[PDB]
Design a protein around this ligand. Structure first.
Ligand SMILES: Nc1ncnc2c1ncn2[C@@H]1O[C@H](COP(=O)(O)OP(=O)(O)O)[C@@H](O)[C@H]1O
Ligand SMILES: Nc1ncnc2c1ncn2[C@@H]1O[C@H](COP(=O)(O)OP(=O)(O)O)[C@@H](O)[C@H]1O
Ligand SMILES: [Mg+2]
Ligand SMILES: [Mg+2]
Lengths: 375, 375
């Protein structure tokens, strides 16, 4: 709801202020194409990795506080918002251009047959999407590369939740192999020690301790991971000795997840800023190239002189516009592309378009970050 | 007290039954010398490794339930039993032949000046000895190799206790370097998470979790370590939310330490058994060598034939005495030593002496293990 206003504000600011400066200097043919409305309406995703019978399917029902189609308390499920409670098989989901699952077609039927999108109107899903994963075992035989599909979600997911069972902590080689496939994205990982009320207090310490022991043994990062310890479902507690703990841990978890759409808003706001800066540089470059072109003859001779002297051009522009060499595009990649452009057809500099962007960066953004601040 | 009877029983059984079979065939000149009474009166030792201000000195006062000389709540201290409360500086301790600290002389004054033996009549010390260690810091500058002296205690100690502070868990590089020096003896290690009542329940989980995380990150062993979580001193509890836990953990700790003298008794009982078996083999070998020697001439010629055919002798004896080739001494090491012996001066086989040992192994040991069983 509130972050749908943020989404609208970003799209608006981009189309009114940034996009015209990209189109004026063919930004989209050099670097990246125009941003579609899909680039803005992204809800942060969560990947649930956990062995069989850990409680992932219940964990989802616990957050949503509601059932979802084809939940059945094994395959991949993408739980997302939807006007009506419905289910979409994977073979059809990977064709939907309004879904991030279009690239998943590379794994094929053996995977698609074990892939589904369950939709339902639920508050949680208005803000984020949950991707359940098949329960890892503790033999093997899947007609798709299970460790590569897991890897693929991890790179496009905002949060990864390793799920472990305090009643039966049995980290398997397959699970460990999956965790080693998530490395390089440890900041996305959190852990959940479920069914904590099933064991007595001493046993919880042995299990929880043996968990961290073997995790750090695997991830080999000085940055210890966060483990939310509790019993995550609607049922009563068995071993109430740590009731207060399990409740604070659940609140710490709800706060983590509830922050994801906010963190995403900022990430998008920063990406829009960086894009708007790159567009400025691109406009200053093309403009200078146009400025120097002769009024009539020696056009192809001047074009090649500019391309060869492009490194000097960069420094020329950095100084007379106080801009960083960091948001400049790579020198050689430009030169390779500037070969294919009639320099004389470029547009002279349009101060009207740059002012529109600089007025966005100085004034218009301070308010959005204020709209994000009001959680 | 009770394990002083075990000590006496072992010494008695060795002197009455084993030692005469070793002396009859010069066992002590080939393999290992006669066992002194010191070889039996060993009390298991404990090495306390822990950073500064963790509470080691209090931890010791907690177990003993009593002060000890020069405790001062930094240097090595060997807390051991003693008729009277006294203190012995290190420069004099390393000269005492009735102390295992005679080899420590290799590190010298810079270490000896930071080494002491505090004695006192205390029940705990009748059974075991505690070796406090200087508090590791969290700079460096000691005039002795701190990581080599620690290593030296670890190899002769029965139990190593890593001590950590839940109020300020700051594993330092020096401490980690020490823990890496204990590897290869992980079975001796236990951990103690002290001051657990100082933090709230959630913070305990973060600290305890971060501990195991970085420990397994260091020791790299699939065998997770045991961490006794509590507040180990006579004072009341601050955060009573986990009173029951901290009490069971302390009892689990007292049971671990209280078992050490029993485990040692068994280790000695097994070592005596293995020695008595090796003595038998040695007696059968020397006897056979004597048996084959000619009654008069060709003595040096026969001696060399036997030594060369000694591998065949081993198999000859293994079969006609149903004994394992495992407790046989190395073939070549014997041959190198059998050069220096007038074979004709050996003694013929003495069935009287072997029966004395076999009667010890069949009958006399079943009772000692019963004396150990009665904890
Ligand atoms: N918080 C909990 N405490 C104890 N048992 C639970 C809890 N949550 C789920 N379970 C049990 O664990 C089983 C596994 O549930 P499910 O989530 O379907 O498996 P998976 O997590 O592998 O999808 C269920 O039968 C349920 O009864
Ligand atoms: N169980 C405990 N809980 C809280 N504080 C403690 C506990 N035991 C000791 N302390 C405090 O920690 C400090 C360090 O004590 P000491 O054992 O002398 O240091 P070290 O362990 O480095 O020898 C002491 O001043 C004491 O007040
Ligand atoms: Mg599931
Ligand atoms: Mg101390």
């Amino acid at each position: 709801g509130g972050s749908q206003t943020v989404t609208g504000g970003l799209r608006s600011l981009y189309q009114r202020k940034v996009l015209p400066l990209e189109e004026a200097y063919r930004f989209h043919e050099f670097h990246s194409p125009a941003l579609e409305d899909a680039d803005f309406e992204n809800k942060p995703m969560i990947l649930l990795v956990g062995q069989y019978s850990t409680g992932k399917t219940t964990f989802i029902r616990y957050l949503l506080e509601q059932d979802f189609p084809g939940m059945r308390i094994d395959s991949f499920i993408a739980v997302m918002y939807g006007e009506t409670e419905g289910s979409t098989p994977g073979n059809a989901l990977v064709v939907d251009p309004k879904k991030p699952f279009r690239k998943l077609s590379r794994f094929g039927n053996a995977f698609l047959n074990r892939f589904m999108c369950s939709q339902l109107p639920n508050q949680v899903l208005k803000s984020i999407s949950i991707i359940d994963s098949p329960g890892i075992l503790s033999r093997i035989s899947r007609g798709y590369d299970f460790c590569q599909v897991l890897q693929w979600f991890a790179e496009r997911v905002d949060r990864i939740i390793l799920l472990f069972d305090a009643h039966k902590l049995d980290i398997s080689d397959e699970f460990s192999e999956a965790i080693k496939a998530f490395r390089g994205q440890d900041d996305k990982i959190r852990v959940v020690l479920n069914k904590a009320d099933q064991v007595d207090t001493q046993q919880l310490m042995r299990v929880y301790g043996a968990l961290m022991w073997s995790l750090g043994k695997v991830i080999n990062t000085p940055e210890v991971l966060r483990v939310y310890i509790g019993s995550f479902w609607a049922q009563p507690l068995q071993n109430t000795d740590n009731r207060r703990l399990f409740e604070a841990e659940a609140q710490d978890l709800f706060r983590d997840i509830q922050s994801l759409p906010q963190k995403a808003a900022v990430r998008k706001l920063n990406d829009l800023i960086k894009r708007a800066r790159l567009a400025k540089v691109h406009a200053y470059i093309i403009s200078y190239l146009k400025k120097e072109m002769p009024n009539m003859f020696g056009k192809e001779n001047k074009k090649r002189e500019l391309i060869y002297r492009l490194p000097e051009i960069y420094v020329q522009l950095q100084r007379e516009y106080q801009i960083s060499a960091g948001d400049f595009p790579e020198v050689k990649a430009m030169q390779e592309q500037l070969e294919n452009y009639d320099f004389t057809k470029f547009h002279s500099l349009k101060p009207k378009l740059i002012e529109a962007v600089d007025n966005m960066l100085t004034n218009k953004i301070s308010s959005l970050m204020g709209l994000i601040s009001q959680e």
